[PDB]
Structures are given as structure tokens and as C-alpha cells.
Amino acid sequence: KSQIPRLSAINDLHKIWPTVEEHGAAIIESFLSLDIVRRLNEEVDPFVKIEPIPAAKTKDHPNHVLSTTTRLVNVLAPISKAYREDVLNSKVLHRICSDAFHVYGDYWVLMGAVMELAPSNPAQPLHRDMRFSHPIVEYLKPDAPATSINFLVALSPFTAENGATHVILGSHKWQNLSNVSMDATVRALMNPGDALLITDSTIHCGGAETTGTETRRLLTITMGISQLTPLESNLAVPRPVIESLTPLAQRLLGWASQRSAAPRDIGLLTIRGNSIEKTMNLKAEQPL
Amino acid sequence: KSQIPRLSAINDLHKIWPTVEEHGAAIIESFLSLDIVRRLNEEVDPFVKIEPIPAAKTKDHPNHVLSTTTRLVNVLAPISKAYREDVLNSKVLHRICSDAFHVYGDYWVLMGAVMELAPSNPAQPLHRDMRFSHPIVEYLKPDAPATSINFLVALSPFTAENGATHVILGSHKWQNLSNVSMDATVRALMNPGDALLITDSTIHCGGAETTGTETRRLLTITMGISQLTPLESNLAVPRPVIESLTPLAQRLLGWASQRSAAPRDIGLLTIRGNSIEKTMNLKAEQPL
Ligand SMILES: O=C1N[C@@H](Cc2ccccc2)C(=O)Nc2ccccc21
Ligand SMILES: O=C1N[C@@H](Cc2ccccc2)C(=O)Nc2ccccc21
Ligand SMILES: O=C(O)CCC(=O)C(=O)O
Ligand SMILES: O=C(O)CCC(=O)C(=O)O
Ligand code: NI
Ligand code: NI
């Protein structure tokens, strides 16, 4: 059976979205440079170590879906300079997203999270994303263009033995889920900085960690149309941090108004005909 | 032909959503008391008078759809005590919305706006709402439950001669728009405080003002599932105003996290497993 298509971030940029559109998955080799992965890991390191179990009894909004051997930390902008600057302004990410979402309009980050899987983390069940947060997506027509996509960026090696992600190629066009089986999957073997890109309809799952020693870490960036509400809030991010960002990064974090692709678009998150950024006179690219 | 069903806010509360579900429209008599209409009008009065044309060349996000004889003012919470307290906490509104949106989860205000139509304002073309802001809604399956509804509350008399709203009953279940004609419409004749309730699929239009003397005003409250992005932002509303509100009103304005109806809901606008309100220690019901 056939493997996940691999593409260069540098040379095959225009081929990336068409490939995902056709097959439901693609590996973008060197999506983030090793330098950015290095800085990213450095900055989130302590935050993943202090993170409790997904369903911790201290949480307002516990996650009952992820395994107890999973640590997920989101709202990365205040934690990570590499995230807020380098990845939020990634030229490759933005070309792919504008390729993907042009039918709808503006897009933004629905969630940027680092996930770390402890040794011997079991495989997740095969699934489509968004079903625990956006029930609306299940009511979309089967051929509706994808309203969100997920960049699963390796922050450590992805191997078959350490639980590299499984995908079923072509499953983004499936309606019937009766042939859903691990038998039908292929693996995303990746070096740090490579990214597996899937859609909200691609059937996939985290793999079983079988070494008992390796700790797999990933940066999952769910990008979605600005018409859908993010899983995470940047409302509590200090204004000096927000004002350090580019206008584009600000929009991605919900600190700007948004636009649909309707010819006479009337806009989203507007204030009596004016943008958030104008109204609040929000500054941009003000260094810390 | 048959008229829009009229229901009492007091005695037929449980019948309201089922009626809209069946017919696509209902008139809720005395939705807002005359006292609340009175205070509401008093408070927004100067803000509608200073409002420029919808497509004013000074605007970041001009509205090119509304007539030049329309004045729309939104983000009402900072302007209006009656809005922020009485209508955002309306028991009737919240019963109807929880009736309507229980399949999806939490709902919030996509837009609360006062619209005032000058004398001799022409009829709007027949339309469905949401098509200039949320192209996603057109990709929903035809039988998907409505993801937003619109309360068109009369703030002055609605008469046939002064341009009372037209609706086509049953048109929320139409797929084929070839019998779209003013011939097929009936009118929402209303006293101040009555509300016409429609869905995002109900075909309707503002009427032609024919007296040349009357000024019609309405409060349009588009309520929608929390999975869809509001047309307006409350990000720039002073924190003392937000802290004067109830927790429910805060959630409605995007100053709280939200939940979907998925059995293991992982939530919306959350911060590392915790709510906005906890994280920012947002106070509630702190009087001005
Ligand atoms: O918690 C998350 N559940 C997934 C789906 C899922 C996860 C495990 C087992 C079954 C299903 C999701 O829908 N969205 C995301 C996206 C980024 C990170 C985590 C999640
Ligand atoms: O501008 C708005 N256009 C409408 C649709 C429309 C209006 C006039 C003529 C044709 C179509 C809309 O989709 N949403 C709203 C909702 C509240 C107030 C105004 C509008
Ligand atoms: O662990 C992985 O590689 C994939 C994680 C995932 O699919 C999810 O949590 O939604
Ligand atoms: O003017 C009216 O009564 C209806 C207004 C309306 O439907 C709209 O602006 O979307
Ligand atoms: Ni997943
Ligand atoms: Ni309308």
C-alpha cells in the first residue's frame, strides 16, 4: 500500500495544499528549521512538565478524551518567542492556509498546542478532529471544503516504534466509516521540524509508544476559518506581548477583526463598522 | 394566505421555538416590556443619530449591503444599561435559545444592533441572513438544525405602510429559491416590544417605507451557537462595564469560555484546561 506523500517546504510549496486535497495528508519536510524547533522546545519545556493530567480535577474545562499519559499545553504566545514570531508568521503555513481557505475568507489559529506523550503511551482511537468542540462541522455537506486543517509538527523524532501518527489516505472523502481499521493506516515517520498536514476529515490517530523509554513531542497547529470559534483564548495574554507581534500574528490570535470571502463582506468581530485594531489603537511590532 | 403565528411571551413560552421550527417565523407579543423599550430607545438615541451611512468612506469595515437610509449601531453593552442588564438576561430569550441550540451547545450574541430606517427607506431585497459574514452556513446540510436565529424587536410601531418586515412562511425549509417573490410574503405587524423571531434560513426583507414621514426602529438580536464567530466584538468594552454584568451576560459577549454539547466536550476559548473567567479573575455583578 501507498505511503504519505512527502513534499519540500522550499521547492514544492504550491503542491502542498493540492496534495492534501487529493490524499488527505502530506508530510512537509523541514516545515520548521531545527533552530526554531530547538528554541520552541526550550521555551515550552517547563510548561509541559508542570502540566497535570488532561482531566485534572482542578480544571474548569477538563479534557476527558486524551490519555493520562498525554500532556497538552496551549496558549503558546506568552510562553514562546519562537512560536509567536517564527511560526505564527511562517510563510509556508500562510501560503497553505490561504490556498486552503480562500473560498471562506480569513483564517486563524483554532489551537496551537504542544503535546508530549509519556513512554508507553497507548495509541489513540482512530478519529477525526473537531468532534469534541465543534459539533457544527458534522452537519456540513460531505463535499464542503475543509473548514480546518491540522499541522502536526514533530518536535522530536517520529518512529513506528515510538508511536508516530497513523493516517488513512483518502479517508477525508469517506462517508462510510465501516472500513475504519488500523489495517488501513500508514505512518508519518518524521524528523524534528517535519510536519504532517491533515484536514478535519482525515481519519488518523496517535500511535502506540512501544519502546517504554522514548518521549514523543509534537506541536499541533489547528488552523481554521475565522468563522469558527477557537478552542483556546488569547484574551488573557498581556498587551505588551500582543503589541510585540505583527498585525498578521495579532489577527491569528483574535486580536484583530476578520473578513469573510463574500463579495460584499460585512466582517467579523467589528465595532460599529470599524476594526478591533483601529478602535483599541493596538500597536504592532513593539519590541519587549 | 396564512399569517405569522402570534404567541404570548408569558403563556406560550414553550410553544415559541416549536412554532418557529415548523413555520420559520413567529411573533412574540410583548417580548420586551414598554418600560425596557423606553429606556433602550433613550440610551441608543444619540448613537443612531451620529451614525454615518453603512458604507461610510471613514470605516475600516464598511457595510455595502444596507441602504444609505439605514443606520445600524452595534456593540450596545457600553451604550445601554437596559440592553446589558434586561435584554441580555431576558428569561424568554434564553429559554428560546436553549430550546433552539441544545443540539449544538452554548450560544451567544452574534450581533445585537439597533437599526433605524429613515422616511421613504426602500424595501430590502428578499434574503437569508448570515451570507455576508458566514459563508460556512451555506455549506450546512439542508436539514441541519439552525445555527443562528434573529429576534427582530420593534422599538417603534411596525405597520404595512411604514415598512414592517416581510417573511415567507415555510421558506426556512426551501432549497429551491425560484418561487421567491414578494407575492409569497406576509407582514410582521407589531407594537413596540413585540419581536419577530426568524431563523438563518427564513426568507425575509425589510419593507418599503411609504408614508414619507415615519421613522421605523428595531433591535435585531442575532443569537447563534458559540461555535460561530460573532459579527461584532466586545473586546474594547471597559472592564468595569463587563464586571457589572451577570456571568450569563458575560458569556454572551465573549467574556467567558464556552461549551459544546459533545458528551466529552473539550470546550471553546479555554486556557490550558481553564476558563477565561477563572484565569482573568473576572468579577460579576459589580455595580457602577
Ligand atoms: O483533545 C483533542 N482531541 C481530538 C480528537 C481525539 C483525540 C484523542 C482521541 C480521540 C479523538 C480533537 O478533536 N482535537 C484535538 C486537537 C489537538 C489536540 C488535542 C485534541
Ligand atoms: O447587514 C446585514 N445584512 C443582512 C442581509 C441583508 C440585508 C439587507 C439586504 C440584503 C441582505 C445580514 O445577513 N445580516 C444582518 C443582520 C443584522 C443587521 C444587518 C445585517
Ligand atoms: O499523537 C499524535 O500523533 C496525533 C494526536 C491527535 O491526533 C490528537 O490528539 O488529535
Ligand atoms: O428592516 C427589517 O425589518 C429587517 C432587516 C433585515 O432583515 C436585515 O437587515 O437583515
Ligand atoms: Ni487528532
Ligand atoms: Ni435580514
From Swiss-Prot, chains A, B:
Disulfide bonds: none annotated. Keywords: Dioxygenase, Iron, Metal-binding, Oxidoreductase. Its cofactor is Fe cation. It catalyses: (-)-4'-methoxycyclopeptine + 2-oxoglutarate + O2 = (Z)-4'-methoxydehydrocyclopeptine + succinate + CO2 + H2O; (Z)-4'-methoxydehydrocyclopeptine + 2-oxoglutarate + O2 = (-)-4'-methoxycyclopenine + succinate + CO2; (-)-cyclopeptine + 2-oxoglutarate + O2 = (Z)-dehydrocyclopeptine + succinate + CO2 + H2O; (Z)-dehydrocyclopeptine + 2-oxoglutarate + O2 = (-)-cyclopenine + succinate + CO2. Fe cation binds at H127, D129, H204. One of its GO terms (biological process) is biosynthetic process. One of its GO terms (molecular function) is dioxygenase activity. Pathway: Secondary metabolite biosynthesis; Alkaloid biosynthesis; Mycotoxin biosynthesis. It is an enzyme of class 1 (oxidoreductase). Its EC number is 1.14.11.81. It comes from the Eukaryota. Transmembrane segments: none annotated. Iron/alpha-ketoglutarate-dependent dioxygenase; part of the gene cluster that mediates the biosynthesis of the aspoquinolone mycotoxins. Within the pathway, the iron/alpha-ketoglutarate-dependent dioxygenase asqJ acts as a (-)-cyclopenine synthase that converts 4'-methoxycyclopeptin into 4'-methoxydehydrocyclopeptin through dehydrogenation to form a double bond between C-alpha and C-beta of the O-methyltyrosine side chain. Homodimer. Belongs to the PhyH family. This is Iron/alpha-ketoglutarate-dependent dioxygenase asqJ. The gene is asqJ.
